[PDB]
Amino acid sequence: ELQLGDIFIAVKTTWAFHRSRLDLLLDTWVSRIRQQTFIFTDSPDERLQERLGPHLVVTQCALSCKMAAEFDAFLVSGLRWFCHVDDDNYVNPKALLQLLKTFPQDRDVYVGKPSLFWFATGGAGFCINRQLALKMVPWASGSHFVDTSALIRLPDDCTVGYIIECKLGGRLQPSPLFHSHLETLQLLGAAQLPEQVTLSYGVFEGKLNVIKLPGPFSHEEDPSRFRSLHCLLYPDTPWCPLL
Numbered sequence: 001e002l003q004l005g006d007i008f009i010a011v012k013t014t015w016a017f018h019r020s021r022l023d024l025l026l027d028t029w030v031s032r033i034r035q036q037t038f039i040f041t042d043s044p045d046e047r048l049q050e051r052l053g054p055h056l057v058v059t060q061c062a063l064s065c066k067m068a069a070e071f072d073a074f075l076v077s078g079l080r081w082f083c084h085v086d087d088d089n090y091v092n093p094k095a096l097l098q099l100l101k102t103f104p105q106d107r108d109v110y111v112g113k114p115s116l117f118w119f120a121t122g123g124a125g126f127c128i129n130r131q132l133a134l135k136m137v138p139w140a141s142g143s144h145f146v147d148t149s150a151l152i153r154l155p156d157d158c159t160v161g162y163i164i165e166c167k168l169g170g171r172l173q174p175s176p177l178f179h180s181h182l183e184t185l186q187l188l189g190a191a192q193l194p195e196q197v198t199l200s201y202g203v204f205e206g207k208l209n210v211i212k213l214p215g216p217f218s219h220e221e222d223p224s225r226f227r228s229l230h231c232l233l234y235p236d237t238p239w240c241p242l243l
């Protein structure tokens, strides 16, 4: 009985990437799940403001100021599930809902792709339910009645895992379905690709790391492969080409 309406998807971006990254996401996966997706940035934008309205959150800035903004906005929302992704992630909402239905409904859950205390790599995307997120507030807000000395020199993703494992006694539940670009993405082809919850694109150890799809867009038209993935998943989309 969990539905898509129970999920708050937060995307982190910055002004310098509005044209280069954000427009691509708005054309592709954000167009299939706009009602649940909120874009956190640091300057206004006429084009994004047009397409998103209040779904464009312009911040004027323990956790970084944008991540604190995402947590605060999620809690205000009241929704059961929080999922964080970066501006170089692709989200499959159908695969996401199927995974989230798999957890017992009254247990704390933190799910993602593990990295070394264990933490979910932020560039792969990760999800937390409301009950666990509400328990994180004292640390996540940098409040004056908990110890955050350890929190101040950790990145956002690490900080999240530390709070959950080290302060709350919880545990990361690993899933093979979340993917960063710190991963050899070429093992994921047309056959595996539809079962995945997130994909990524980017440079790591000197290699442009992308999923393996022959088309329907060329690498020159679609270097991230996100347009091609989108067309595999949603072939009814009018702007999808043949190849």
Ligand SMILES: [K+]
Pocket: 062, 063, 064, 151, 152, 153, 154, 155, 156, 159
């Ligand atoms: K921190």
